[PDB]
Amino acid sequence: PKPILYYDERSPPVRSCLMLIKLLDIDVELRFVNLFKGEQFQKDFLALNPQHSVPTLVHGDLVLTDSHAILIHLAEKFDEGGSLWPQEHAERMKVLNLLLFECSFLFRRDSDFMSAIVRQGFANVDVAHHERKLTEAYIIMERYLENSDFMAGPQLTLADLSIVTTLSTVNLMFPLSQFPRLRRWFTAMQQLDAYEANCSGLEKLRQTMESVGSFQFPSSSAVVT
């Protein structure tokens, strides 16, 4: 049976999977789970994924509950032998390493900030604290791109798909003026046809956050091309 993706496109790791699905032309059934309405706590979804998170993939009997496993699984099954999840061991470990940076560092910090806004309202968030935490992530990505054209080496990999969605989300709030390699790379990602899959959920996330958090992102921060 074809893969089933439980999704809310406002989430950047969901959008990373949508980008890969578009890039490889994978036929997938989409099932919406509204994270802001709490539909991830519905009894049936909880039984399927006790972490109450999207993206969740059901592909036959395999149930994957983390975007990075979903990206690797889909690459192995639909980009067999390809370069998104490279064949050579060291290149593949480099991609894996950056997927884990996205999980453990970039997304961890973006989620900390966004959840603070939802729970507290923007006016009651220590924005400076989160600006420091997220600028630190910018600095690290800039260091990676000083030595490499894409995040994990000379060509597009799963690492770029995973990182660009969260980066575009962080950059709704924090400008990239001081980060020329990151700007160049983000601009290049924005030219990819697959990036069209990031645009709609990024904008829906912007709308939802401004309403739920009672604020406006600074329009000047987002890199637009």
Ligand X SMILES: C[C@]12CC[C@@H]3c4ccc(O)cc4CC[C@H]3[C@@H]1CC[C@@H]2O
Q: Which one of a copy of itself, ligand X, none is in contact with 114 (Cβ closer than 5 to 8 A by kind)? A: ligand X
Distance CA 79, CA 73 (A): 10
CA-based Rg of the chain, rounded to a whole angstrom? 17
CA distance 84 to 186: 17
| Alpha carbons 8 and 41: distance in angstroms, whole number | 14
By the rule CB under 6 A, 36 interacts with ligand X:
yes
Interaction between residue 162 and ligand X (CB under 6 A): no
List, in order, residues 6 or more apart from 105 with CB less than 8 Å away: 137, 140
Applying CB under 6 A, the span of 42-50, 113-121, 132-140, 150-158 interacting with ligand X comes to: 113-121
CB of 211 to ligand X, least distance (A): 12
Q: Which of 114, 125, 163, 194: binder of ligand X (CB under 6 A)?
A: 114
Smaller CB separation from a copy of itself, 10 or 68 = 68
Q: Out of 5, 14, 64, 125, point to the residue binding a copy of itself (CB under 8 A).
A: 64
Part of the chain binding a copy of itself (CB under 8 A), chosen from 72-80, 124-132, 161-169, 206-214: 72-80
Find all residues with CB under 8 Å of 46, minimum gap 6, and list them.
40, 52
